[PDB]
Design a protein around this ligand. Structure first.
Ligand code: NA
Length: 318
């Protein structure tokens, strides 16, 4: 698809000191011959765990779609007939008891990518209605509902080697559009020669925002081959002061079971999906692995000092 054609020391510390309690790859049924990866966070609908997956052949020129899957066994998901989107990298949020769903839409002219943008949909998994679009050539836009009911919006401008995560508060999802996302001011998250993005935002009991995302940079492996490193990253935003706290690596490719990446320069790449709280007080971190599989690791809850999650991703029928 679109992506395929100091943190280095922080990562080496993480690789030495990591606490991983469980480690699996997900099995997907019903889409044989496609890879499934870079999913949404899992959510609940009709009493069942579901996830949206990015569905794409291994070939770097193959185009992505998104399908809905339902949990049919432990770490086993079966495609739900009847729901397709022409998108990459799907993601979900709950705003006023409604699903907001998004993905990256790729526009082509004479078999080459001409533009891409975030498409946003609202409703429930049985019927999602496309309603707004992000700015030209931006991805990694994410929303959540804040403690006062307003809409937090994360942007992610990226032009060559200049990238930032931005953030703006809107009154409601009815204001979400290209110009307000484009004008979101920067947050102090990404360093020079790095990139990254929010994948899933959570409202915490303190009123702060717990972010699960990715942090990325260029490196060279032991065999002196190029790698675009992607790590699972967390931080906590204070939406009033805009201060960033407790920024840290929470997962890396070595945490998940071994698997072939889509291309050789994604051998140390994981693209976060989100966390699900467990019966044992730990977090299940779901992630894309090598732009080819979806994995799950059990980790310490990454927002302990800033509070527990407010609300859930259990979606009511319309
Ligand atoms: Na991407």
């Amino acid at each position: 698809g679109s992506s395929h054609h100091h943190m280095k020391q922080t990562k080496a510390s993480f690789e030495a000191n990591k606490r991983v309690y469980e480690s699996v790859l997900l099995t997907f049924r019903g889409v044989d011959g496609y890879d499934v990866y870079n999913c949404s966070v899992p959510f609940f609908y009709k009493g069942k765990m579901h996830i949206y997956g990015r569905v794409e052949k291994r070939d770097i020129w193959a185009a992505s779609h998104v399908r809905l899957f339902e949990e049919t066994g432990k770490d086993e998901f079966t495609v739900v007939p009847g729901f397709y989107f022409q998108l990459e990298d799907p993601y979900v949020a709950k705003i006023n008891n409604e699903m907001i769903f998004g993905g990256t839409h790729v526009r082509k002219d004479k078999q080459e990518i001409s533009s891409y943008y975030g498409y946003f949909y609202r409703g429930t998994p049985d019927e999602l209605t496309y309603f707004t679009t992000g700015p030209d050539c931006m991805k990694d836009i994410r929303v959540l509902q804040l403690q006062d009911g307003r809409l937090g919006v994360f942007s992610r401008p990226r032009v060559g080697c200049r990238a930032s995560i931005g953030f703006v508060i809107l009154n409601s999802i009815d204001e979400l559009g290209a110009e307000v996302i484009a004008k979101a001011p920067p947050l102090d998250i990404l360093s020079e020669n790095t990139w990254g993005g929010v994948n899933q935002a959570y409202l915490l009991s303190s009123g702060k925002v717990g972010c699960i995302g990715h942090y990325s940079y260029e490196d060279t492996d032991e065999q002196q081959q190029p790698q675009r490193v992607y790590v699972n990253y967390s931080f906590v935003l204070d939406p009033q002061s805009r201060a960033i706290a407790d920024a840290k690596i929470i997962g890396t490719k070595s945490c998940y079971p071994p698997c072939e990446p889509k291309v050789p320069f994604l051998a140390d790449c994981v693209f976060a999906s989100g966390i699900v709280m467990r019966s044992d007080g730990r977090a299940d971190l779901y992630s894309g692995v090598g732009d080819s599989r979806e994995g799950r690791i059990t980790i310490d809850y990454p927002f302990k000092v800033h509070g527990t999650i407010i609300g859930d991703l259990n979606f009511p029928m319309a």
